[PDB]
From Swiss-Prot, chain A:
Signal sequence interval, chain numbering: none
Further details from the record: Present with 28100 molecules/cell in log phase SD medium. PubMed:12898710 reports two tandemly repeated copies of ATP3 (ATP3a and ATP3b) on the right arm of chromosome II in several laboratory strains, including S288c. This has not been confirmed by the yeast genome sequencing project.
Protein's name in the database: ATP synthase subunit gamma, mitochondrial
Similarity field: Belongs to the ATPase gamma chain family.
Compartments it resides in: Mitochondrion; Mitochondrion inner membrane
Subunit structure: F-type ATPases have 2 components, CF(1) - the catalytic core - and CF(0) - the membrane proton channel. CF(1) has five subunits: alpha(3), beta(3), gamma(1), delta(1), epsilon(1). CF(0) has three main subunits: a, b and c.
Functional summary from the UniProt entry: Mitochondrial membrane ATP synthase (F(1)F(0) ATP synthase or Complex V) produces ATP from ADP in the presence of a proton gradient across the membrane which is generated by electron transport complexes of the respiratory chain. F-type ATPases consist of two structural domains, F(1) - containing the extramembraneous catalytic core, and F(0) - containing the membrane proton channel, linked together by a central stalk and a peripheral stalk. During catalysis, ATP synthesis in the catalytic domain of F(1) is coupled via a rotary mechanism of the central stalk subunits to proton translocation.
Swiss-Prot record, chain B:
Name under which the protein is recorded: ATP synthase subunit beta, mitochondrial
UniProt EC number: 7.1.2.2
Miscellaneous remark of the record: Present with 164000 molecules/cell in log phase SD medium.
Matching SUPFAM superfamilies: C-terminal domain of alpha and beta subunits of F1 ATP synthase, N-terminal domain of alpha and beta subunits of F1 ATP synthase, P-loop containing nucleoside triphosphate hydrolases
PROSITE patterns for this protein: ATPASE_ALPHA_BETA
Gene (name only): ATP2
Key word Ubl conjugation present: no
Record: residues binding ATP: 152-159
Source organism per UniProt: Saccharomyces cerevisiae (strain ATCC 204508 / S288c) (Baker's yeast)
Assembly and interaction partners: F-type ATPases have 2 components, CF(1) - the catalytic core - and CF(0) - the membrane proton channel. CF(1) has five subunits: alpha(3), beta(3), gamma(1), delta(1), epsilon(1). CF(0) has three main subunits: a, b and c.
UniProtKB/Swiss-Prot annotation, chain C:
Note: Present with 41500 molecules/cell in log phase SD medium.
Entry-linked InterPro entries: ATP_synth_asu-like_sf, ATP_synth_asu_C, ATP_synth_asu_C_sf, ATP_synth_F1_a_nt-bd_dom, ATP_synth_F1_asu, ATPase_a/bsu_AS, ATPase_F1/V1/A1_a/bsu_N, ATPase_F1/V1/A1_a/bsu_N_sf
Complexes and interactors: F-type ATPases have 2 components, CF(1) - the catalytic core - and CF(0) - the membrane proton channel. CF(1) has five subunits: alpha(3), beta(3), gamma(1), delta(1), epsilon(1). CF(0) has three main subunits: a, b and c.
Full protein name: ATP synthase subunit alpha, mitochondrial
CC per GO annotation: cytosol; mitochondrial inner membrane; mitochondrial intermembrane space; mitochondrial nucleoid; mitochondrion; proton-transporting ATP synthase complex
Lineage, uppermost ranks: Eukaryota, Fungi, Dikarya, Ascomycota, Saccharomycotina
Subcellular location: Mitochondrion inner membrane
Positions carrying Phosphoserine: 14, 135
GO biological process terms held by the UniProt record: proton motive force-driven ATP synthesis
Residues carrying the site annotation Required for activity: 364
């Protein structure tokens, strides 16, 4: 009875893990996307500043 | 005096512009000297700006220049002293003996700017240097006449690696060498000077089998840039005119790149990506192309490269990355694991590691090592969270073999007897191929893991097994 | 001998005539001489200095014409005649360039005497239009098993070779050149692809190695290598693919077939950056010259597949792009990825994992796809695409108590992946690609253990040659696999597997 409950629980748990992990992917994806945009802008400003002089 | 007299017009930063009198304008890349109480400031003419105004980069400090101070023209690019009397000197950017052995007894001078040998001149080669370092020998051997490149991080044990290399390769090499230091610390400089005086490479009673051109990072921003060039010309004289083989060594060549960034900025060229010079490509090219194995002779560069903040996607290491024949990337991670040499086995690639070139046996053994280590790296994530509790029987064997191979790389070095104290070990090329072959076959998979740490060949692995047994 | 040739040469220079237009350098710095004069100067026209360096005049500015020097700075010095050559950048083009290593200008750098050429054509001419181009329809078999099955390459459609730094990207390309020897050698002139390899920004030693390797495989005789090495001045590096395209045009226009492999456009980009920034033209994204998308797009669209109206020529192209740390989001890679019509994505991990060529099967795509692929090879390797797809998905499940179905996939998949490795710097004929792949597809080699897969491969080829080189010859020439041929093949594989 125990062995079945254990393996059943592990399935349930790892399933909830996959979901939680998915949520973290989505959250860090937005952070990644923003961070990427920010680097392009910040770098661009440095070049502009040089040219302007 | 020459009617070529210029009056300084602007002492800016390192940039000092001179305003020569009518028609006589010193050509781009020539060298101007301004007599100073210090001695001679050498300024390299670097742009012509029209209306008889040249704009030059200083190669010595610009403090104390007085606007309108008369400037003589040498008439050609900074002209070094070259000879076989340049063996055992320490000459600086302007080519003056900074080791106080008195005047360099040179027969000839040569320009620091000379065009690389033409396409016709190039001649293919492939001979295998024997480093005598286990990781290097098996997994990406270095090749004579090549352009070996010691790429590596910040403080990942770069100095230790270089020191061992000098001990092995320099003594082994038949020809003279020129050890040229572009912008590395004067503490490191004194250590190198001392170390090769001790090792007798520099024998100041006898004749030295090496020359030095040390320009160190206390030197003005300009000088750091064209100090590398100074060294190249000493090597060229050996390669061409004296016909011997050479073994030029430059350290750290990222500093050459870095130096170029500085004088770009000062010259006022709009800075490029991640602040590197617009002339980034061509500047790398002028240095790298010049040093190659012609039909005249052979010069085998060994160049240290410093990867700023251990990111090899940064444009400066990456620009260097292309030109060098036999990369070895010393990585921080591998250093932390305690593997010394810190060469990262899965990132070191040589272009003369080819199956025909290194021989079929060498090739097969080394290919097997690469796959084994790479699988282990892939498995590392699974082992981390899940554990080894669902890794198959094959996988468990792969983990065990890989862990043994992984630590078999470490070998105590001869200059790491003050950094460790376990006597240095140099294995033969043949011996490294054999010893690793055994491990892979699992002939020594009965040996405990710690007997692969800091050992020589297979014979040593057996000896350390006995040590543990006690 | 040599004396006679020199005597011919002195005789071969004659007195000149009055030369229209002159300049005097106003200031020459940074390899960007800016000359005051040159009243009528065509834009991008080649201008020759007093010293002897050549330049082109990228900026015609309102009062000064900004020449870019094609050599070392030292050569030009402030104020000095700047003669007007009077012909916009053009390079010799012709059938005669076959087998010579020539620099961007077109001068022989191989040193095998004067380049005999049938025309000089300008190096900026616009690409074939909407009505001239007719859709791709002729396979180009690169000879690498993985390229030929997984990602078919057809005549006249550019496909990128984008991959991680120094993962022997050039090797994948060089292999294509070698395989073209097989068709090339013969007499069918609607089969010969005359390749031109454009080595831009590679050290002179590397290009020397290239030259030797091509000579070694007896391949210089359909190769032209335009080489503008790392040493060569930044204008020469800039004009190097553009020049190269013009070399290609003779082949395309005259109605041959040809494949020009631009290696590597990543370095082409760097050169354009150097020119633009030094000429003070406005900077732009990632400090790359402002119109950088436009530059790459011009080069890569000169490739085309001409219509039957226009002589049915072709000019396949294969740019190579070096991805710095594999970041395919980088501005120079991203632009190129958009411009190209396909990708082959070589992955460093795979290279390390012993799969060489290291084509990442998942991340490569062919956008012209099934138009290419020999009909025979298409039939027996539709399956191959699908099988590998499953193997990829079920890959991570290789860490226990696994379904029989899962295990079947794993066995078949591991064997296929092992099968598709190709020994470096050797191409493999198409007539032997179809048999080898057939075995894996039909699952005959599923039983064979992984270590013996390699041995099996070579054995199968020898077995095919001995037992039924009739079968092989039929496969080669018919070029389409009829049910009867597939029947014979099934038998042959059965026999081979049994031994």
């Amino acid at each position: 009875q125990g062995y079945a409950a254990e393996i059943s629980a592990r399935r349930n748990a790892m399933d909830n893990a996959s979901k939680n992990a998915g949520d973290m992917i989505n959250r860090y994806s937005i952070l990644y996307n923003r961070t990427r945009q920010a680097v392009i802008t910040n770098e661009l400003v440095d070049i502009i500043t040089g040219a302007s002089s | 005096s020459t009617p070529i007299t210029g009056k300084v017009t602007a002492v800016i930063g390192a940039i000092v512009d001179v305003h020569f009198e009518q028609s006589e304008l010193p050509a781009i890349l020539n060298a101007l000297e301004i007599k100073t109480p210090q001695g001679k400031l050498v300024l390299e003419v670097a742009q012509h700006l029209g209306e008889n105004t040249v704009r030059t980069i200083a190669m010595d400090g610009t403090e104390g220049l007085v606007r309108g101070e008369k400037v003589l023209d040498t008439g050609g690019p900074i002209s070094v002293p070259v000879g076989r009397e340049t063996l055992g000197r320490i000459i600086n950017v302007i080519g003056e003996p900074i080791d106080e052995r008195g005047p360099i007894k040179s027969k000839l001078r040569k320009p620091i700017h000379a065009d690389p040998p033409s396409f016709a001149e190039q001649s293919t080669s492939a001979e295998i240097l024997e480093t005598g370092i286990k990781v290097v020998d098996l997994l990406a051997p270095y090749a004579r006449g090549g352009k070996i490149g010691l790429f590596g991080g910040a403080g990942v044990g770069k100095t230790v690696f270089i020191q061992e290399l000098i001990n092995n390769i320099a003594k082994a090499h038949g020809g003279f060498s020129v050890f040229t230091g572009v912008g590395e610390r004067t503490r490191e400089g004194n250590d190198l000077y001392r170390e090769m005086k001790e090792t007798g490479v520099i024998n100041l009673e006898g004749e030295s089998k090496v020359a030095l051109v040390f320009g160190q990072m206390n030197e003005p921003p300009g000088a750091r840039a064209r100090v590398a060039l100074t060294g190249l010309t000493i090597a060229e004289y050996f390669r061409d005119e004296e016909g011997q083989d050479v073994l030029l060594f430059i350290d750290n060549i990222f500093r050459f790149t870095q130096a170029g960034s500085e004088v770009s900025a000062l010259l006022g060229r709009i800075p490029s990506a991640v602040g590197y010079q617009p002339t980034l490509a061509t500047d790398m090219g002028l240095l790298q192309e010049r040093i190659t194995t012609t039909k005249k002779g052979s010069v085998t560069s060994v160049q240290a490269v410093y990867v700023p903040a251990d990111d090899l996607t940064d444009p400066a290491p990456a620009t260097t990355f292309a030109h060098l024949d036999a990369t070895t990337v010393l990585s921080r991670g591998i250093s932390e694991l305690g593997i010394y040499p810190a060469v990262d086995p899965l990132d070191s690639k040589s272009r003369l590691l080819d199956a025909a070139v290194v021989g079929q046996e060498h090739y097969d053994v080394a290919s097997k090592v690469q796959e084994t280590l790479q699988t282990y790296k892939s498995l590392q994530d699974i082992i981390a969270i899940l554990g080894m509790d669902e890794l198959s029987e094959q996988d468990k064997l792969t983990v065990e073999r890989a862990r043994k191979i992984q630590r078999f790389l470490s070998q105590p070095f001869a200059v790491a007897e003050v950094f460790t104290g376990i006597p240095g070990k140099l294995v033969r090329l043949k011996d490294t191929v054999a010893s690793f072959k055994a491990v892979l076959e699992g002939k020594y998979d009965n040996i405990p893991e710690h007997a692969f740490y800091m050992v020589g060949g297979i014979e040593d692995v057996v000896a350390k097994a006995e040590k543990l047994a006690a | 001998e040599v004396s006679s040739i020199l005597e011919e040469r002195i005789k071969g220079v004659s007195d000149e005539a009055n030369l229209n237009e002159t300049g005097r350098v106003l200031a020459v710095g940074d390899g960007i001489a800016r000359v005051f004069g040159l009243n009528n100067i065509q834009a991008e026209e080649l201008v020759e200095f007093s010293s002897g360096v050549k330049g082109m005049a990228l900026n015609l500015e309102p009062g000064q014409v900004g020449i870019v020097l094609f050599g070392s700075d030292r050569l030009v010095k402030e104020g000095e005649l700047v003669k007007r050559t009077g012909n916009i950048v053009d390079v010799p083009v012709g059938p005669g360039l076959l087998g010579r290593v020539v620099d961007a200008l077109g001068n022989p750098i191989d040193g095998k005497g004067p380049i005999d050429a049938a025309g000089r054509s300008r190096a900026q001419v616009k690409a074939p239009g909407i009505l001239p181009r007719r859709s791709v329809h002729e396979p180009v078999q690169t000879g690498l098993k993985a390229v030929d099955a997984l990602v078919p390459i057809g005549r006249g459609q550019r496909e990128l070779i984008i991959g991680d730094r120094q993962t022997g990207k050039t090797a994948v390309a060089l292999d294509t050149i070698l395989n073209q020897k097989r068709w090339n050698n013969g007499s069918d002139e609607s089969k010969k692809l005359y390749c031109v390899y454009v080595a831009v920004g590679q050290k002179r030693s590397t290009v020397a190695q290239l030259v030797q390797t091509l000579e070694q495989h007896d391949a210089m005789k359909y190769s032209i290598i335009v080489a503008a090495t790392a040493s060569e001045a930044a204008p020469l590096q800039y004009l190097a693919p553009f020049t190269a395209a013009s070399i290609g045009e003779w082949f395309r226009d005259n109605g041959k077939h040809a494949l020009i492999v631009y290696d590597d456009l990543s370095k082409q980009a760097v050169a354009y950056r150097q020119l633009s920034l030094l000429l003070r033209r406005p900077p732009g994204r990632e400090a790359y010259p402002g119109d950088v998308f436009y530059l790459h797009s011009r080069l890569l669209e000169r490739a085309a597949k001409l219509s039957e109206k226009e002589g049915s020529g072709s000019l396949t192209a294969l740019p190579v792009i070096e991805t710095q740390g594999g970041d395919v989001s980088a501005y120079i890679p991203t632009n190129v990825i958009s411009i190209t019509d396909g990708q082959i994505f070589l992955e460093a991990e795979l290279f390390y994992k012993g799969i060489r060529p290291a084509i990442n099967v998942g991340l490569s795509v062919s956008r012209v796809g099934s138009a290419a692929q020999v009909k025979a090879l298409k039939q027996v390797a539709g399956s191959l695409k699908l099988f590998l797809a499953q193997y990829r998905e079920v890959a991570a499940f290789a860490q226990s108590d696994l379904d029989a179905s899962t295990k079947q996939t794993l066995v078949r998949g591991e064997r296929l992946t092992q099968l598709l490795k190709q020994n470096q710097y050797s191409p493999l004929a198409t007539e032997e690609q179809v048999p080898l792949i057939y075995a894996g597809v039909n699952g005959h080699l599923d039983g064979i253990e992984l270590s013996r897969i390699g041995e099996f491969e070579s054995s199968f080829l020898s077995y095919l040659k001995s037992n039924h080189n009739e079968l092989l010859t039929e496969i080669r020439e018919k070029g389409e696999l009829s049910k009867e041929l597939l029947a014979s093949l099934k038998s042959a594989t059965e026999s081979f597997v049994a031994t």
